[PDB]
């Protein structure tokens, strides 16, 4: 892994940046503000019409139809009037013979599926059911007043062609949520009040009286509050940076901040700044440092030494009183 990160198969001795661990499968935690439960399903029906061109290729008709659920005696504008919603697409295929009359089912060559592509919208249609929150979300077949639009396309074994457009009118907020607990002390994928990420959530006994959630200077979530009992939870990344020491193409040690095993190393010691894991059988030591870093050095047996300042006898002083020393026996230094 270090070789792949460093883009070379022959590593020179030294220190290389690694992660304290790797993140695999995780659970999802979602936290929202209290509300009533009222869920709606929005089913969109797309009827595609296909013909065969004079060149023998499938052509998707512009006479394909989109049908939204019935609302206020209409099926051209459907909007949300509940607290939660989900969206589904149901597709159908028909065939024609250049007469624009669709009476037969779609053949194997002409079979197509209806796909809704992002278009100009700042979200995907398939991602609406991923806990996105709006103050207003409302779909139309007419372009007036629309903030953005999706693209309706027919996908065939050899092609994909846009046939229609679906327009969206939305207002940001948290009143409506699109839908398909809290996990503590383990790495989890969290969506807390619209803040999304991966990390570890822990319960602290701190007492912050103001606000709901807290962020860092870069915008990362650092903690949040439970709206029922006012308990503050802290959020930390579930991996940190570490330094691996490589001598003669092998891992001999690793400096880290988490007191947990990494990189296959078992033994460890504590230094005023970090934890040093190593192959050396820990419970100082005398060895020659092979590699150096900051104020410390690492030997060939994976042991840690601290580099001291240079020592000298001292400077001769301009004093003529008592017993004094004058240098006598001289060699040459270059």
């Amino acid at each position: 892994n270090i070789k792949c990160s460093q883009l070379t198969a022959n590593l020179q001795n030294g220190f290389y940046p690694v992660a304290s661990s790797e993140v695999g499968l995780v659970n999802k935690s979602v936290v929202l503000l209290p509300s009533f439960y009222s869920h709606t399903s929005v089913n969109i029906t797309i009827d595609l019409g296909m013909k065969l061109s004079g060149y023998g290729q499938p052509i998707a008709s512009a006479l394909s139809n989109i049908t939204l659920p019935m609302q206020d005696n209409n099926t051209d504008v459907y909007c949300i009037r509940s607290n939660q919603f989900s969206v589904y697409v149901h597709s159908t295929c028909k065939s024609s013979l250049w007469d624009n009359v669709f009476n037969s089912d779609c053949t194997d060559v002409l079979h197509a599926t209806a796909v809704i592509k992002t278009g100009t919208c700042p979200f995907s249609f398939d991602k609406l059911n991923n806990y996105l929150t709006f103050n207003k979300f409302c779909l139309s077949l007419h372009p007036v007043g629309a903030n953005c639009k999706f693209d309706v396309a027919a996908r065939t074994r050899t092609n994909e062609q846009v046939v229609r457009s679906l327009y969206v009118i939305y207002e940001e907020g948290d009143n409506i949520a699109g839908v398909p607990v809290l996990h503590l002390d383990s790495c989890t994928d969290y969506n807390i009040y619209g803040k999304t990420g991966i990390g570890i959530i822990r319960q602290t006994n701190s007492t912050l009286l103001s606000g709901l959630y807290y962020t860092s200077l870069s915008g990362d979530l650092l903690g949040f509050k439970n709206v029922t009992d006012g308990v503050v939870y802290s959020v930390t990344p579930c991996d940190v940076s570490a330094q691996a020491a490589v001598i003669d193409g092998t891992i001999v040690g690793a400096m880290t901040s988490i007191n947990s095993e990494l990189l296959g190393l078992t033994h460890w010691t504590t230094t005023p700044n970090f934890y040093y894991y190593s192959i050396y059988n820990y419970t100082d030591v005398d060895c020659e440092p092979i590699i150096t870093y900051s104020n410390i050095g690492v030997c060939k047996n994976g042991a840690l030494v601290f580099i001291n300042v240079t020592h000298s006898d001292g400077d001769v002083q301009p004093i003529s009183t008592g017993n004094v020393t004058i240098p006598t026996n001289f060699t040459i230094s270059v």
Partner: protein
């Protein structure tokens, strides 16, 4: 007279992959397509720090015998004084009233630290084991660490420099080099310095008391100024500027992670939670480009500052060698007078 000279910079380690991608596995594969972009930044930053460490290490040194004599207790005792110096009460003598503010004392928190050093380090975070427990909300330094920004100690350290300066101070009174720590009074060394300036032909009416009193009063007024005389003001301003610049540089790099770079959001997890991968990749590429440009600018500014501190350290080395470890024959080099 007081003079401040900067010797080293504060080394900063940047984890480029964690700065650009906030640990997101999908952003890492996208950043891989930028060939050797993080590697170049990391290598430049590491090479600069290694060169500075090598240059600094060939300048600091200590001697054990001089370290045994460099304390207020040693200067106030008559233990190490050579037998001929029986009339003298202690090493420091009438000069001690000043030397007590400059010499290290055991009435201090850290080893080899003096009162003036305490005042300077109070008037004008290194442990990252506290940023992982999650017992409270993280502070600024822990958050910067979460963003891939670490501040490390180098070979040049407040401990090694204190040992260096204490050994330099204690080496003035070391009478011989072959064996144990033999000591001479401070007044004897001052008399030798006076003889170097001009051969003293009045051996009877010596008036070193006037010089000692003036030195004590000057050191006392300097110590007052450091805790609450234009040289002291200039030194304080220079130290404050040096400290402020590095903090501003670090904070400006963290404020660039809140920039959209013409994308829908500034959060990679927010982009990958709202868009299909074909479009989320095109939105994340802009953040990757902008966040790499920011790191390149940071590296350039750091290398320029290291280049200037090189010359500053050369001047400091000359001052130590020619004003502290010897008496200079250059006019006006070690102060006005």
């Amino acid at each position: 007279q007081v003079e401040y000279i900067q010797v080293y910079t504060t080394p900063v380690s940047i984890d480029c992959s964690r700065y650009v991608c906030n640990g997101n596995p999908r952003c890492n594969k996208l950043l891989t397509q930028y060939v050797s972009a993080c590697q170049t930044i990391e290598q430049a930053l590491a090479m600069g720090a290694r060169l500075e460490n090598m240059e600094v290490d060939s300048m600091l040194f200590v001697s054990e015998n001089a370290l045994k004599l460099a304390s207020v207790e040693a200067f106030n005792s008559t233990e190490h004084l050579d037998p001929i110096y029986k009339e003298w009460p202690n090493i420091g003598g009438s000069w001690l009233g000043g030397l007590k503010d400059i010499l290290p004392s055991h009435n201090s928190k850290r080893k080899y630290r003096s009162a003036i050093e305490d005042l300077l380090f109070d008037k004008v975070d290194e442990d990252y084991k506290r940023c992982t427990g999650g017992y409270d909300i993280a502070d600024l330094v822990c958050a910067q660490y979460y963003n891939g920004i670490m501040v490390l100690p180098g070979v040049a350290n407040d401990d090694k420099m204190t040992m260096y300066t204490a050994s330099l101070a204690g080496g003035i009174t070391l009478g011989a080099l072959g064996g144990g720590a033999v000591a001479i009074p401070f007044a004897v060394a001052v008399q030798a310095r006076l003889n170097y300036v001009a051969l003293q032909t009045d051996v009877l009416n010596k008036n070193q008391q006037i010089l000692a009193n003036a030195f004590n009063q000057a050191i006392g007024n300097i110590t007052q100024a450091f805790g609450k005389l234009a040289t002291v003001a200039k030194a304080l301003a220079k130290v404050q500027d040096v400290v402020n610049t590095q903090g501003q540089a670090l904070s400006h790099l963290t404020v660039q992670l809140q920039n959209n770079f013409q994308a829908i959001s500034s959060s990679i997890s927010d982009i990958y939670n709202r868009l299909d991968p074909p479009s989320a990749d095109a939105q994340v590429d802009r953040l990757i480009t902008g966040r790499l440009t920011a790191l390149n600018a940071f590296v350039s500014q750091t290398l320029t500052r290291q280049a200037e501190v090189r010359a500053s350290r050369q001047l400091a080395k000359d001052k130590v060698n020619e004003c502290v470890r010897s008496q200079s024959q250059r006019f006006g080099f070690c102060g006005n007078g």
